[PDB]
Design a protein around this nucleic acid. Structure first.
Ligand SMILES: [Mg+2]
Ligand SMILES: [Mg+2]
Ligand SMILES: [Mg+2]
Length: 803
RNA sequence: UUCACAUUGCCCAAGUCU
RNA sequence: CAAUGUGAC
């Protein structure tokens, strides 16, 4: 349960496409570099302070140490040199004074860059991480002090333009940077990005932006409690400067004119000690430093210090502004990356140059293949076949594979009658039934119940009424006035309390209908009621389908930024037929920000039991698409989850030992692919076509991984989903697994489109997000309560309630 | 809460010294 | 999924 399998072979399927990748070839010398351990007393210091004290150390001790110029530093305890120092293994004790630190330098090892060549060149079977790490510290050294680091990125205020967001916020532009091995050479992966920062401005102006003042002196009265509290919400925890830098822990209730402390008042303290007649004595003070102490600063002598990222959620308007400032077509993104690289000129970086590293200033050429889509089999009399083109098809003149006959259905309208009238409801009903009939999901007559209601309180009694009164009720259609707490209450009651199918619809989509919205609505309804919308052309499926096989999708979704106690949510779904089309779901709450799926063995067990009850087959193979695990987590996640899958098999039966293929799906990474030739660009966004596959050149040097961009790019630059096989009892070839993966992206029931990840992984998200909806404002005994809230009713268990 | 795509929010990463 | 865009007939 540990070593990922070797790349079995290379894919051959599909016509070829010329692509460029945002990977830049690196020439690394075949030489040793030297590793040194450091430690800085005191070590509570931020990473950036350490880099300063080490920089001053290098220039200061230039002569009795560090004669061999230009070491690089990782911000804590690791230092590299291109040539060795006059150190020996002997520690060395040094003192440095920062404008008072002791630092010791112990040698630790060499890092043979020659061995890295070999690990890339099939000589060595494993890629030496420590060597990659060292190169990464080299490449990051200068920009970590020149710009503001944020994760694997770097940001800066852009020269000559501003992008204010308002509320004291503005857009900074930046780039991602990382060092990757590949089938070819080392790769410098660069991508542009953008994120919100606070403006380095006088706190006074910060006040005026936050409170929506055109200016100060507007007015000269002290702030309302309402104004003061809002300001306090914005600036608490931010850094300010007066030489001196402080973190704001509070805003005082009193103005500086009257705010006092044991020496005296604030206006007068600055008048006497600093000859400062405050221009705005009526305004409060910032509390800074130890919250137990009484260090107060008048607003007027304070600026927001530069380079503080905005952590808090952006407002709706800010968000709008942000989108508008950063939205880029694929060709425009490609050009921005290219521009940025020539601009960056990594080869003039003196530290890169110290280690004799060259970086190519143009994107790597790679060849892709565009896989053929599957054909999609519909039902009805005709049993129509739909042929995807550029990642899209449609249902016009096609009826579902297995369509549900709707005999008994109700409507609850929570939108106000004066806005969503009985006339709207009748027309909507008439249009829906038309579409549903063309779709082969005949809504056989009028609803058995149609009533207005208001408020979350009215939901449960209405639904209890409905469940008790109308035998054979298949659906409640729920009209909502827009965003409302009622939606989450409908799903609480429908999904977990009473076990009743619901389909919510926004009022605007009832008032004004279109065929496409209504048709998409039917796709969800048919599914919710147990129907099969369509299936993969059977004879066009890869060979793996000749034997019972179950397809699992798995995801964990973590709490938002800044959260502290909300659970993370694990979801696992499993196919329940051979098409494969129908899925069932499992879901758990688990520990805050834990990626590993804790209860996975019990989840898979459930899915396997339900698969047998639906199909009367025991799977011979299990295919496990595991979403969202980053590289730095492959081995941890696979050790626990692979064994749990086995555990589930083993505790069911017998030496029931079906082969497992464990695949990590990453939609979010920093690889971007672009059409080399302008005439391959698809649509306004100019993206690579659906089906573009890459498993050469930029992928892993020994393991089994590939990019597949399964979807049509509508806007921006498409994320090519990445697939990495951590385990494979089934010995897929590249072709069969890539084609399987692609084909699974055409089985997603909520649209007649090839989506960006396979359907099982997509459903797992939907399951996790629904649990999250079940926990709204409810997030050992804690654990039990939350577990209970995400638990669907018995009659919901076997359904695609998440669709 | 018709739907997909895309930006952010998510494990690793990053962050924390009068 | 939520905020915001681009689209689907
Ligand atoms: Mg996830
Ligand atoms: Mg961490
Ligand atoms: Mg949206």
């Amino acid at each position: 349960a540990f070593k990922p399998p070797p790349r079995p072979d290379f894919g051959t399927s599909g016509r070829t496409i010329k692509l460029q990748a945002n990977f830049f070839e690196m020439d690394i010398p075949k030489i040793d570099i030297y590793h040194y351990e450091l430690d800085i007393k005191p070590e509570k210091c931020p990473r950036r302070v350490n880099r300063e004290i080490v920089e001053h150390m290098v220039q200061h001790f230039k002569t009795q140490i560090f004669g061999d110029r230009k070491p690089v530093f990782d911000g804590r305890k690791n230092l590299y040199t291109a040539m060795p120092l006059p150190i020996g293994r002997d520690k060395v004790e040094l003192e440095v004074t920062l404008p008072i630190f002791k630092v010791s330098i112990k040698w630790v090892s060499c890092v043979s860059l020659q061995a890295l060549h070999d690990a890339l060149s099939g000589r060595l079977p494993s890629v030496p991480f420590e060597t990659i790490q060292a190169l990464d510290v080299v490449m990051r050294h200068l920009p970590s002090m020149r710009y503001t680091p944020v994760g694997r990125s770097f940001f800066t205020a852009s020269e000559g333009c501003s992008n204010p967001l308002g509320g004291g916020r503005e857009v900074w532009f930046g780039f991602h940077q990382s060092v990757r091995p590949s089938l070819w050479k080392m790769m410098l992966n660069i991508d542009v990005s953008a994120t919100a920062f606070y403006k380095a401005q006088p706190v006074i102006e910060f006040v005026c932006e936050v409170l929506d003042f055109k200016s100060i002196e507007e007015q000269q009265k002290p702030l309302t409690d309402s104004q003061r509290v809002k300001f306090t919400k914005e600036i608490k925890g931010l850094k300010v400067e007066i030489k001196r830098k402080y973190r704001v822990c509070n805003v005082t209730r009193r103005p500086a004119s009257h705010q006092t402390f044991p020496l005296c008042t604030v206006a007068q303290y600055f008048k006497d000690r600093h000859k400062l007649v405050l221009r705005y004595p009526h305004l409060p003070c910032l509390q800074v430093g130890q919250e137990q102490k009484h260090t107060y600063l008048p607003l007027e002598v304070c600026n927001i210090v530069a380079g503080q990222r905005c952590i808090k959620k952006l407002t709706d308007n800010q968000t709008s502004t942000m989108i508008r400032a950063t939205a880029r077509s694929a060709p425009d993104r490609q050009e921005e990356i290219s521009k940025l690289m020539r601009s960056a000129d990594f080869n003039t970086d003196p530290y890169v140059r110290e280690f004799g590293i060259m970086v190519k200033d143009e994107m790597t050429d790679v060849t892709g293949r565009v896989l053929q889509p599957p054909s999609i089999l519909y039902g009805g009399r005709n049993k129509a076949i739909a042929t995807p083109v550029q990642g899209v098809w449609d249902m016009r003149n096609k009826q579902f594979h297995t369509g549900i006959e709707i005999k008994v259905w109700a409507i609850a309208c929570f939108a106000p009658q004066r806005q969503c009238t009985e006339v709207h409801l009748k027309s909507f009903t008439e249009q829906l039934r038309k579409i549903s009939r063309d779709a082969g999901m005949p809504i056989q007559g009028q609803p058995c119940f149609c009533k207005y209601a208001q408020g979350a309180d009215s939901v449960e009694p209405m639904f209890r009424h409905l469940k008790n009164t109308y035998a054979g009720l298949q659906l409640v259609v729920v009209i909502l006035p827009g965003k409302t707490p009622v939606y989450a209450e409908v799903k609480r009651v429908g999904d977990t309390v009473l076990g009743m199918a619901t389909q919510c619809v926004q009022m605007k989509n009832v008032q004004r209908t279109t065929p496409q919205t209504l048709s998409n609505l039917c796709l969800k309804i048919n599914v919710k009621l147990g129907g099969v919308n369509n299936i993969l052309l059977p004879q066009g499926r890869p060979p793996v389908f000749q034997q019972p096989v179950i397809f699992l999708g798995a995801d964990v979704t973590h709490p938002p930024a800044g959260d502290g106690k909300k659970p993370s949510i694990a979801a696992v779904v499993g196919s329940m037929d051979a098409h494969p089309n129908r899925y069932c779901a499992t879901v758990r709450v688990q520990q805050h920000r834990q990626e590993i799926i804790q209860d996975l063995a019990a989840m898979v067990r459930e899915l396997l039991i339900q698969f047998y009850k639906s199909t009367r087959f025991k799977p011979t193979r299990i295919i496990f698409y595991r979403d969202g695990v980053s590289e730095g987590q492959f081995q941890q996640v696979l050790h626990h989850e692979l064994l749990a899958i086995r555990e589930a098999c083993i505790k069911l039966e017998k030496d029931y030992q079906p082969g497992i293929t464990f695949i990590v799906v990453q939609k979010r990474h920093h690889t971007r692919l672009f059409c080399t030739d302008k005439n391959e660009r698809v649509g306004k966004s100019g993206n690579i076509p659906a089906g573009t596959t890459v498993d050469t050149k930029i992928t892993h040097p020994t393991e089994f991984d590939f990019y597949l961009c399964s979807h049509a790019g509508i806007q921006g630059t498409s994320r090519p989903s990445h697939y990495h096989v951590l385990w494979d009892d089934n010995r897929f070839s590249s072709d069969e697994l890539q084609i399987l993966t692609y084909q699974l992206c055409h089985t997603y029931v909520r649209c007649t489109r090839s989506v960006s990840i396979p359907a099982p992984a997509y459903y797992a998200h939907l399951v996790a997000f629904r649990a999250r909806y079940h926990l709204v404002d409810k997030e050992g005994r804690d654990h039990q309560a939350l577990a209970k809230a995400v638990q669907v009713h018995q009659d919901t268990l076997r359904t695609m309630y998440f669709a």
